[PDB]
Amino acid sequence: VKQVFNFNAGPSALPKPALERAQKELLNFNDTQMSVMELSHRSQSYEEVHEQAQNLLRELLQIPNDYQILFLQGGASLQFTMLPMNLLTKGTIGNYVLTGSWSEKALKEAKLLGETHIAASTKANSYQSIPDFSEFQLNENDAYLHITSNNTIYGTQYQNFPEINHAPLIADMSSDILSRPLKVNQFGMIYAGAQKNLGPSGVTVVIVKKDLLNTKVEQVPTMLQYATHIKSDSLYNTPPTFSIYMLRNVLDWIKDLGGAEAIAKQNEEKAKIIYDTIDESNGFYVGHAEKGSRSLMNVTFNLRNEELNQQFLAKAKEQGFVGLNGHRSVGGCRASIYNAVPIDACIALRELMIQFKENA
Amino acid sequence: QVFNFNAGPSALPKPALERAQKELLNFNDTQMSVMELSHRSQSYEEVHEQAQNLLRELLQIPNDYQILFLQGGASLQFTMLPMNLLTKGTIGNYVLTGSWSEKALKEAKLLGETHIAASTKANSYQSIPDFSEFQLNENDAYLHITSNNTIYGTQYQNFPEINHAPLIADMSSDILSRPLKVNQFGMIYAGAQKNLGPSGVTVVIVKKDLLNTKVEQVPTMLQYATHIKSDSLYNTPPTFSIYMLRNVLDWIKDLGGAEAIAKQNEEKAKIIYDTIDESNGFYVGHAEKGSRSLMNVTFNLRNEELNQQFLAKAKEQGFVGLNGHRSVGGCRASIYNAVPIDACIALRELMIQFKENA
Ligand SMILES: [Cl-]
Ligand SMILES: [Cl-]
Ligand code: NA
Ligand code: NA
Ligand code: NA
């Protein structure tokens, strides 16, 4: 048997209490004698779980009342197209800040639907940094300005957010939502696939300023209108009921541990273990990110050559590390250290790194 | 003391749920949950492929069809289909046999020209139209049907021979309830939560050469070609839902497959329909007898006071989900593959006792 150190990038490690709770009641949820998986989405029993998940997110992120929490299917990827479908109208511009591959994927879908613009980009700096907000090129007819808060593939992250008042600020927060407190009122819309930091795959969380998106859009398919899901409270069609249930369990765990401030402290400590190991390695491990733009959620690094990368990753696999290979598009290594990844897995990664360097 | 007649999501096979429970924290000796695996891992890829292979075996899906696992429900397919096939100068042709048929047509109308090949709307969706009635156009992009009209309780007994354009079927509420000649279709889709497991995955069986070409101007996530080329791993799939689907398909396989399940479904439907038919009009089925669904049994008592009394008694006695869909009222006993015959018997007994006490 191998120990498990789960550095998977999404889906990812879950809190053991959330899983254990799910296991215990999998056949009989809340004395109904049915699994949560067997309930109608039109039942009170399910509605209670759906509402509880929203209310927990609201409490934990301090979401103001004029925002609504949607639970959608399709991943963050579907949001790449649904956002411009809803807001990118003739005469306006979808303005994007490019800070990684996920930013590019979002921009690509907007280009199919309307005029786009690049407000700022660190592509020429190999996505090693977040641009200075003073670099942002904005347009009066921007439909929105879109950012990617945590650039999962490159391991960079916004340390704080721009103050934008000329157009709605929109963020793909898939890989750092609820890793720390967040001033939601800075944004018109936030979206996140749940499978990094909120739960399992199969549901996408969208926090939307209601008045921004609660109007039907001409000619847009029913399922692709935010208004449909706003009006229907994410019950227009059949939701991913078990995913939402698991989201509820994960949010309860975050609340039990002390909320967003407590998890931020844990995440900062975890990240420091790994970054100090990189920095103290005299170049044996080299981080992709510039220090000032380092992600607390995905730590990306390389050894001095591909042969060493491969040897390191093979050793890691032998020793029980899961998911440490970088995203296939970039190679290297990526330690994903979302909320539920335990600090002791980070300690183990440090030990592996120190030993590998000494035995090289 | 609970009888689960929910219409979707719905009852699951006990062995599939027990299996999931047992290994929820330690899937296949990995010491993690299936929910904690990367979709880019061999461990998950094996489950993904096994689910496909089980479906392929159980429905005898030919080699020239591919099995996709998508998000969005059957409802997203209502728009994704015409986005991919309803091109300028062609027609999305629909057979209307219920509410779900109308919802599919509505989405196509947003995207191009449509046509009604046949409809039983004027007969209150009490029947499936004779195929001889179908009006077909040389420029049809496809002909779309709904195999089981979940809200109205009617069901195609067999399927039309359509070769001028691909036949497309929303089989959400009866997929894998019986054997199917898949080669009659260009595409079959089904939300999993009626008969294949839990919500959050939609199964799409597609003739590969029909839909494997990129369609200009369609968003990447909404092209079938994206998912075909990527084997439903373009973006992150609903991994737990696909795992559960695998478990349910294994249960179907273990009891003898689609013929065995059809036999069980016919037996348990008979219990309810015989109860209706012997009631001297006290219970009246919505469907014409020759169009009766084996998956959703719809009926009413003689008036709304009696409907309410019956449904209240049912609730008191532990029956879940018998109220008709909110769009039509009355009663609906959903009797998908995993609903046990003993629940159908309990429903019969409830119905007989209620009439006796009325
Ligand atoms: Cl990225
Ligand atoms: Cl229907
Ligand atoms: Na509906
Ligand atoms: Na450091
Ligand atoms: Na990708």
The answer to whether residue B132 is domain-embedded is yes
Q: For residues A295 and A207, what is the distance between their CA atoms, to the nearest angstrom?
A: 22
Testing the interface with B: which of A28, A36, A38 to mutate, by most B Cβ within 10 A?
A: A38
Q: Of the residues B64, B106, B109, B170, which is catalytic?
A: B170
| Of the candidates A202, A230, A237, A205, the residue with the CA atom closest to the CA atom of residue A74 | A202
Residue of B nearest to A26 (CA): B21
Residue B134 near residue B117, CB atoms below 8 Å: yes
Verify that A65 and A140 share a domain, yes or no: yes
CA dihedral B285, B290, B294, B300 (to 10 degrees): -10
Judgement on whether residues A133 and A241 belong to the same structural domain of the protein: yes
H helix or E strand, kind and range, residue B237: none
- Whether A174 and A39 map to the same domain: the answer is yes
B250 and B261 in a single domain? The answer is: no
Contact B202, B73 (CB under 8 A): yes
In sequence order, the 6+-apart residues with CB closer than 8 A to the CB of B161 are: B184
Q: Are residues B24 and B164 in the same domain?
A: yes
CATH code of residue B77: 3.40.640.10
End-to-end CA distance of chain A: 26
Residues B168 and B186: beta-carbon distance below 8 Å: yes
**Quick one: resolution in A?**
1.5
Tell me, yes or no, whether B193 and B265 share the same domain.
Answer: no
Q: Is residue B8 part of a domain?
A: no
Q: Which residues pair with B149 in a beta bridge?
A: B154
Q: Which DSSP string do the residues of B38-92 spell out, in sequence order?
A: -TTSHHHHHHHHHHHHHHHHHHT--TTEEEEEESSHHHHHHHHHHHHH--TT-EE
Asked if residue A180 and residue A244 are part of one domain, the reply reads yes
Q: State the greatest distance between any 2 C-alpha atoms of chain B, in Å, as a whole number.
A: 64
Pairing of the two strands A5-6 and A321-322: parallel
Which residue in A11, A23, A37 is closest to B236 by CB distance?
A: A11
Q: Mark whether A133 and A263 lie in a shared domain.
A: no
Does some domain include residue B295? yes
Domain end residue (candidates: A236, A257, A278): A257
Neighbours of A66 (CB within 10 A): 11
Query: Rounded to 5 degrees, what are φ and ψ at A346?
Result: -65, -40
User: For residue A66, is it left (φ>0), alpha (ψ between -120 and 50) or beta?
Assistant: alpha
Taking the C-alpha atoms of residue A45 and residue A36, their distance in angstroms, rounded to an integer, is 9
Strands B148-149 and A169-172: unpaired
User: Residue A212, Cα to own-chain centre: how many angstroms?
Assistant: 22
Length of chain B: 358
Q: Do A200 and B239 touch (CB under 8 A)?
A: yes
A5 located within any domain: no
A287 within some domain: yes
State the smallest CA–CA distance between residue B259 and chain A in angstroms: 25
Same domain (yes/no): A148, A268: no
Domain limits for position A90: 16-257
Is the CB of A44 inside 8 Å of chain B's CB atoms? no
- What is the H or E stretch that residue B284 is in? strand B284-285
Which residues of A participate in the annotated binding site for L-glutamate? 42
Q: Are strands A67-72 and A204-209 parallel, antiparallel or unpaired?
A: antiparallel
Residue A324 lies in a domain: yes
Q: Residue A301: phi, psi to the nearest 5?
A: -160, 165
Q: How many CB atoms lie within 10 A of CB B111?
A: 18
**The pairing of beta strand A298-302 with beta strand A286-287:** antiparallel
A188–chain B Cβ distance below 8 A for any pair = no
Whether residue A208 is found in the same domain as residue A270: no
B29 DSSP 8-state letter: G
How far is the CA of B185 from the CAs of B143, B195, B320, in angstroms?
10, 19, 35
With residue B326 as reference, give the H or E element that holds it: none
**Cis-peptide into B9, omega within 30 deg:** yes
Which of A242, A257, A272 is a domain's end point? Answer: A257
Within this chain, do residues B79 and B123 fall inside the same structural domain, yes or no?
yes
Residue A23 within any structural domain of the chain: yes
Task: Please tell me whether the peptide bond between A11 and the residue prior to it is cis, using omega within 30 degrees of 0.
Answer: yes
Among A275, A251, A279, CA closest to A192: A251
Three-state DSSP class for B146? strand
Q: What residues have CB less than 8 Å from A241, skipping those under 6 apart?
A: A36, A37, A39, A41, A46, A49, A50, B9, B198, B199, B200
Q: Is residue B111 domain-resident? A: yes
B157 and B249 together in one domain: yes
The breaks in chain A (C to N more than 2.5 Å) occur after none
β-strand partners of A142: A93
Tell which of A200, A222, A257 closes a domain: A257
Asked if B184 contacts B325 with a C-beta cutoff of 8 angstroms, the reply is no
Strand, coil or helix: B102: helix
Chain A residue numbers touching B11 (CB-CB < 8 A): 34, 38
Closest CA to B328 of B155, B190, B124: B124
CATH of the domain at B301: 3.90.1150.10
Q: How was this structure determined?
A: X-ray
From the list A200, A211, A199, A144, the residue with the least C-alpha distance to A172 is A144
Residue B208 sits at the vertex; the CA angle it makes with B206 and B209, to the nearest 5 degrees, is 130
Per the structure, the count of domains in chain A is: 2
Residues of A in contact with B10 (CB under 8 A): 38, 40
The H or E element containing residue B340 is none
Tell me, what DSSP letter sits at residue B292? B
